[PDB]
Amino acid sequence: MDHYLDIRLRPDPEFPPAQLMSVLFGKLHQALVAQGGDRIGVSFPDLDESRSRLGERLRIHASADDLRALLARPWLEGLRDHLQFGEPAVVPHPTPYRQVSRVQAKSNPERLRRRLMRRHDLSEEEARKRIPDTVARALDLPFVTLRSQSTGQHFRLFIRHGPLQVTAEEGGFTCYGLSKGGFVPWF
Amino acid sequence: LSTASVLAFERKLDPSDALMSAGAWAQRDASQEWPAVTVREKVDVANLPSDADTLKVRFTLRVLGGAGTPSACNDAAYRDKLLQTVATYVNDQGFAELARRYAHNLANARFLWRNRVGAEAVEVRINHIRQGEVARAWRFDALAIGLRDFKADAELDALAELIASGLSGSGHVLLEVVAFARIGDGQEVFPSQELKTLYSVRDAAAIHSQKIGNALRTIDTWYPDEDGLGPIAVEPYGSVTSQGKAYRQPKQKLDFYTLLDNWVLRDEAPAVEQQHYVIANLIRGGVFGE
């Protein structure tokens, strides 16, 4: 990534930080996966595990040509009122190894029992008894509040931050920005 | 000359509930007969009809006037002194500054709280109803106009003059606000939550009157310390719910109560900005004294 674009979310009284960042992530998801591109990635420079927050600013790590069209796109724009966005800047030569990822697991015994009974044609009791209380697992990492048709209340967003390494392997990222199995430049 | 234990000021610029409906941007020209948005169950969420890309919000606004005029006051001397100070302020300078700021808020989509977020095009049309007829209309664009920045415009100036006249008591003023926001097909609106229960009138979703009047009065931009946040809804003690921090603390001299007490009893004229803030607070109304 030869150009780094730093999008700083400006504080606003009308909306909270969590809702604003959720809107930002949602808007970016459609602006990156649908738009295409070989490598599309962003990182949270303010990420801290003490407060369990997602950071007060975001950094989109992409190429120079990729960022040139990303900011100009209408979808990715228009939110300049609440967020301060600059232009691409060359990242510092020293860089750490960090991979941002998402944790996928189900915390509901019902989903597992239904999925099992709808495949092997089991009974209601067979699926209920087969799912014990030790089968309910969910990520405990910091999860930003994203409210959508999935959950009425604030729903957690599972984001896994990769440990710091020396060797940094780049490559193509996901569409919604999920980890594709490689780290990203950490500045 | 102590203060009056009983003080009340009737609110001015009091809006009504804000109804919501759905339609298409093409149909914006003639919003009549637009189907309303009905609450549904899943918790409860409200989404536009299957084929609808534009949201409509309609709420009226009245200008009563006589902001400084107290509804109830224990002492006559205090009331007269207050009225004199208010008259002096009006004579020196008119409400054109407040009217202009209010005009900007109405032009932009600041009233809408969450629906505007992620809104590509918001078109507002503010009419003027006199004797049942539309005397003069105006059409603005919320997206192009800065939400946190105040810019001068001919239409805005004319609207500010009309509002200033109404507040001064020249004549009755009625404003019909209509907003159109492009979100997307099957998107989810964010109405005012009720104590999840969504606010609904006549089996139609809407937004609370106070929730709109709170945003319309975001005129507090003179706080002692600025971190770049922008205008804060005019409130005593400059309190902010979302930020969880209270600016314009009582320790300083910028406090509303302190400023009013000094400017009335002690005849200490505060900065012009503070005078505007005090007039805005009086317009909002409340309970003072003891």
Side-chain angles (χ1 to χ4, degrees), chain A residues 11 13 16-18 26 31 34 36-37 41 45 55 62 64 69 72 74 78 86 88-89 92 94 96 105 109 127 132 136 138 142 152 162-163 168 171-172 177 181-182 185, chain B residues 1-26 30 34-39 41-49 52-90 93-96 98-113 115-119 121-129 132 134-140 142 144-146 150 152-154 156-184 186-194 196-201 204-224 228-244 246-250 252 256-272 274-290:
Chain B
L1 287 68
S2 181
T3 61
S5 60
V6 184
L7 287 174
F9 300 101
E10 296 179 0
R11 58 183 176 181
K12 271 61 182 183
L13 303 179
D14 182 10
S16 61
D17 301 327
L19 303 175
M20 299 190 300
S21 61
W25 186 272
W34 274 23
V37 185
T38 63
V39 179
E41 301 180 359
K42 182 170 182 188
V43 297
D44 296 358
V45 297
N47 299 331
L48 284 70
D53 58 357
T54 304
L55 188 72
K56 175 189 178 193
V57 183
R58 177 177 177 280
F59 61 74
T60 59
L61 176 61
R62 291 196 307 162
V63 183
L64 303 178
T69 301
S71 62
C73 193
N74 303 123
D75 185 6
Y78 181 88
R79 174 172 181 180
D80 299 331
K81 184 62 175 180
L82 180 61
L83 292 175
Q84 288 178 1
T85 300
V86 167
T88 302
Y89 172 88
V90 171
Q93 53 181 170
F95 299 155
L98 300 178
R100 182 177 58 85
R101 295 179 183 275
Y102 276 108
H104 290 54
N105 292 334
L106 293 166
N108 51 70
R110 176 172 290 94
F111 54 82
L112 299 181
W113 297 82
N115 289 337
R116 181 181 187 176
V117 177
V122 180
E123 184 178 5
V124 180
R125 305 181 181 181
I126 306 177
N127 301 329
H128 178 47
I129 302 176
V134 296
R136 184 174 178 180
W138 298 282
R139 305 176 62 180
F140 303 143
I145 295 170
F150 302 149
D153 184 4
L156 296 172
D157 300 330
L159 209 76
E161 290 177 1
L162 181 58
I163 287 176
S165 61
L167 292 173
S168 62
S170 303
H172 193 266
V173 180
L174 175 55
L175 302 177
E176 180 180 357
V177 184
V178 188
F180 304 132
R182 289 186 58 84
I183 316 182
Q187 291 289 0
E188 182 175 359
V189 291
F190 298 91
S192 57
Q193 183 175 353
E194 276 289 2
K196 184 177 184 180
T197 55
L198 306 180
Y199 178 77
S200 60
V201 298
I207 305 177
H208 297 104
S209 59
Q210 67 280 8
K211 184 174 178 181
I212 299 162
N214 180 26
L216 291 180
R217 65 179 154 77
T218 51
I219 309 297
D220 180 9
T221 59
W222 303 280
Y223 28 80
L229 190 160
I232 304 176
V234 170
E235 288 293 357
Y237 303 156
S239 58
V240 191
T241 61
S242 58
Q243 299 296 347
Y247 301 93
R248 191 183 298 276
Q249 299 178 359
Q252 290 71 358
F256 164 74
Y257 297 146
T258 302
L259 289 164
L260 180 61
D261 295 332
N262 298 332
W263 192 18
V264 169
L265 303 180
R266 303 179 182 177
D267 304 333
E268 295 179 2
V272 176
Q274 307 299 354
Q275 298 178 8
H276 288 84
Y277 181 70
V278 168
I279 295 289
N281 274 320
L282 291 174
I283 291 165
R284 174 187 181 276
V287 183
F288 304 143
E290 183 179 1

